[PDB]
Symmetry: C4
Subunit: 117 residues, 4 copies
């Protein structure tokens, strides 16, 4: 049987933009997406450390190096600029592969600077 496992997450990144109109999804610096192994158009869950809200949407790429985290469309009701959020994707696999599965985790410092190790 098949497990759902954490694929990767952006841990405690800060929302940089929030615009109800127009567009939607959560636009994320492509460098951040690569670090966490998250793909453009992949389903993502967003857990807001600042306000406690939890919601699910999908990832789109923002410009590499922009350090952008933009919550757009209806999702803009769920976060504000400055909020600290955790952004996660999940994947499925057989139990055997799940047992030794390792998520990609990206950590942050300062103004959404990616932290090493």
């Amino acid at each position: 049987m098949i497990r759902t496992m954490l694929q990767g997450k952006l841990h405690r990144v800060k929302v940089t933009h929030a615009d109800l109109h127009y567009e939607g999804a959560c636009a994320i610096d492509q460098d951040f997406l690569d670090a966490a192994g998250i793909l453009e158009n992949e389903a993502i869950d967003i857990w807001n450390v600042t306000n406690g809200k939890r919601f699910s949407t999908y990832a789109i790429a923002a410009e590499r190096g922009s350090r952008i985290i933009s919550v757009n469309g209806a999702a803009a009701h769920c976060a504000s600029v400055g909020d600290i959020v955790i952004i996660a994707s999940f994947v499925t696999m057989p139990d055997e592969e799940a047992r030794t599965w390792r998520p990609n985790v990206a950590y942050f410092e300062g103004d959404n600077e990616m932290k090493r190790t």
Copy 2:
């Protein structure tokens, strides 16, 4: 391993009807379903740009050309006539196919007129 990807969405369509009783689900003009690639009886997520609510239900077909978006049953607690919503379906596939996956997106103008390109 297997990714969950955005299959397609109706972007910023307007709710035309909301009836708590009876029936359920979200009835959507079949032309809209075809445009976004969404199937009758497929699980859909609905993100309400107007009121911020997010909920999951399933799609049923409304008459082709009716331009109808009817939120029925318990879902009628989550949207009102006139609300702007995003309606999405998600599918799973191997990582390799996910990397070059392209969602179907349908956009709207005026009174739920589908916008081209």
Copy 3:
């Protein structure tokens, strides 16, 4: 790629019992489970037509013929005796099978009497 489709639902059944302690899940007359094609220990979504709440739990069997719908454990915070709810399960399959997929739907009358056709 793989679609998530409505497998079956109990449409507008009434909650008969709600006990926060102890046990959990939603216990459902086995005849109702068979009618909707829902299995013991299968994940189910519950949409409360009366109070608007939406939550996910799993199905357990109640005695055949009891006409019971018991919301237990934490789920008892989400429904009250007398509430009208829709109980659904979802399954996955290839797109080809999804295109002609037919959900099992069970309808109700009076005191959770299953309605024919």
Copy 4:
């Protein structure tokens, strides 16, 4: 077609720690994880019997024998020390295997002592 089934649960365990900062997820005594068959980095749903909240996160191991249930990061908004929660994982399998599927259930007494049978 493929069913989503309850894999296992921790039934009515008590939250021992809740820290918004830092880390995230829900750290759970590894002995408890083994008992319910839940894996490190597996998606889990948490249903709070005390306050009614329901949320989804992922499991991480706490020290074997610590009897720890720590809700961390954004999840700390959803439970408090002392809350009674049910922690569940779900897996997918073909309908045939689902029909005779048996979830692992772990029960608790006193100060998160695992109860036998």
